[PDB]
Structure 1
Amino acid sequence: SAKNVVLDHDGNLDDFVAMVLLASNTEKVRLIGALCTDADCFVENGFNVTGKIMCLMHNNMNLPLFPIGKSAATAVNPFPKEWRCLAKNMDDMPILNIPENVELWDKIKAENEKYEGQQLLADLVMNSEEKVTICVTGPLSNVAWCIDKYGEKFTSKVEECVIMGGAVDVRGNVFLPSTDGTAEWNIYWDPASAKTVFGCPGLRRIMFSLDSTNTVPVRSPYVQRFGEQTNFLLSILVGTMWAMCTHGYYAWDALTAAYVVDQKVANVDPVPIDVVVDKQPNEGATVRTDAENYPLTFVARNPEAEFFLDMLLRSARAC
């Protein structure tokens, strides 16, 4: 049967496509909850879009409602405000504002806005009968908060943490006048938390760094294929989000969520991953460490691109 999955995201466009993938593959994934972080989005918008997507799907296909929580995590190095506003735009898109669907969200909103994201992640993981796979598409602040507070009690409950983040053998994507371009954004947002997660013993981590995600870019011809499926709400939703990315833009979080759905997406290789926490040009960089007895992270490599793109197009036909 399907495995338990919690999505820990920061509400940008690819975070939502990742959400769709997880929630539309009911045979492989049982999405038991989600949390949104005020990183690459303003959490109130990220929170509402999460809920609106969950209700549109729930009212049109097989998908049990699940808890959604706002994480109190705060930034160390914030995302450029320009990219963050994207959840706001999504929040106003017609396909996410069908009355019957918004109506549902309005009735269940009170319950969900009561949860605190980090504590909800700890609870969903620990109180689960089966182990829980965590799909992290935003910064690692939340998995770190759980580790710092419950240690082995939390980590022993995690099936595996499938993380979108870092740059191992390729350049990063954090280009500011104070950085050298070796770091990737999710790690850079909160380096200390990333260090805690990558250096945590007894936690299995799958890592989709820029090494894998650079090989699956957002391309117009493929994006137009969603036009062949306008009869499906999800194809209108997914095609519309990627239309705002194509112009530089990758399916970062989507590919990552695709792996949680089906491991065929990519093979993973063991690498001791440490994180630069100092205020230097390479702050947030993910580097190999040969330090004695350091935990091994399984880096994804050479992703099956066609397999992924096909998985997404077909999944966007769930409803």
Structure 2
Amino acid sequence: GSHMAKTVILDHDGNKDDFVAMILLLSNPKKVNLIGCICTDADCFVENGFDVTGKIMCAMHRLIKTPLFPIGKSTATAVNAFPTEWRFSAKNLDDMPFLNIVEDVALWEKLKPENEAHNGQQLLADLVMKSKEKVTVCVTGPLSNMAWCIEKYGEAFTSKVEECVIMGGAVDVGGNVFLPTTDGSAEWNIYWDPPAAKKVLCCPNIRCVLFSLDATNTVPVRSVDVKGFGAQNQYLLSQMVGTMWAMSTHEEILRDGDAYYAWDALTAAYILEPTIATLEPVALDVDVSKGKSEGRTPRAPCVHVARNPSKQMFHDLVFASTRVC
């Protein structure tokens, strides 16, 4: 009546934040049975994102005996690609000492061929449709994989989704896509593939919970907090998350307040702690045009938008989860 874990798939795109989200999900087996991961070539180079996902899976299997699970590289392609500099973070992570423990590298190398054979879109569809229980899909990259599954399988897929908890969009606040060809109103995950986001967010047959910039703006990644991992450096997961966050704490200074945030991590935290935010039903009209507002998610119900997230609950959950091992 509270003692059974939710079945979850993480559909991510391999930035630092994506991996913090993976760690939060995977480190909490009482609450989450992570049955698969999809990695998309969006805010990473997919081979690096794939390898980091595999090595984290292997490390956690070793330390706390969470099951192994299938991992698939999506073949989704960008409409509007991420900045190249951002996409390298998974390469840096692949090279970190905490991600190169000999035993973990060896297990991943053993498991890699079976996973390499997966198509990520097909794997998402298969895991959802074959699962005994309805599945929560946590989407922390673009919506391309969910769109593909909806288009191919319709009800046979949507009927098996418990809910889809998505990082994307910006409803009543500005976006984060600042390019010569954009007006600053759009958020990157939507902007990468706007038609896919339009197809999913207003699909009347799935419950979507949307962590847009409205909510994620509450959780900038800041030195004062990140330094807290030092007290827990004996835990591998604290080495991991602390390093992932420490790589990003300068961005708020660099960009004059436009921080690196715990975007995906907060999204995953909702699955672990549904009282972490309040939900507001909202109808959205996703901009799929080629004009300056491409990818905007203005108000036109399509989704349940997260509001007023608890910074304290988030903090506590991250620090506790990173003491698991």
TM-score in same-fold range (> 0.5)? yes
In structure 1, what is the equivalent of residue 189 of structure 2? 186
Matched, 1:201 2:195: no
1:241-260 correspondence runs (5 A): 241-247=244-250, 248-260=259-271
Match of 1:309 among 310, 315, 318: 315
How big is the shift at 1:157?
0.7
Moved over 3 A (4+): none
- Aligned partner of 2:32 in structure 1 is 29
Match of 2:45 in 1: 42
Residue type at the aligned position of 1:9: H
Residue 52 of structure 1, aligned match among 47, 51, 55: 55
SS of the counterpart of 1:76?
Answer: coil
Number of residue pairs matched? 314
Structure 2 residue matching 1:287: 3-state secondary structure: coil
Which sections of structure 1, spanning at least 5 residues, go unmatched?
290-294
Indicate yes or no: 2:223 matched with 1:220. Answer: yes
CA displacement 1:186-233 (0-9 Å, x = unmatched):
000000000000121110000000000001111111101100001100
Partner Cα separation in structure 2 for residue 317 and residue 67 of structure 1: 25
1:145 Cα offset (Å): 0.3
Aligned partner of 1:63 in structure 2 is 66
> How far is 1:296 from its partner?
2.8
Distance in 1 of aligned mates of 2:192 and 2:103: 37
State whether residues 203 and 302 of structure 2, in contact with CA within 8 Å, keep that contact through their aligned partners in structure 1: no
Q: By how many angstroms is 1:304 displaced?
A: 0.6
Is it true that 1:91 corresponds to 2:102 in the alignment? no
Counterpart CA distance in 2 for 1:203 and 1:191 is 18
- Partner SS state of residue 4, structure 1: strand
Aligned-residue CA RMSD in angstroms?
Answer: 0.6
Deviation, 1:287, is 1.4
Gaps of 5+ in 2: 251-258
Tell me, what secondary structure is at the counterpart of 2:283? strand
Q: Tell me whether 1:111 sits opposite 2:117 in the alignment.
A: no
Shift of 1:262: 1.2
Partner Cα separation in structure 1 for residue 76 and residue 107 of structure 2: 28
User: In structure 1, the residue corresponding to 2:41 is in which secondary structure?
Assistant: coil
TM-score after normalising by structure 2: 0.96
For residue 293 of structure 2, the aligned residue among 255, 259, 282 is 282
TM-score (ref. length: structure 1)? 0.98
CA-to-aligned-CA distance 1:77-124 (integer Å, 9 cap, x gap): 000001001100000000000001111101111111110000000000
Q: What letter corresponds to residue 134 of structure 1 in structure 2?
A: V
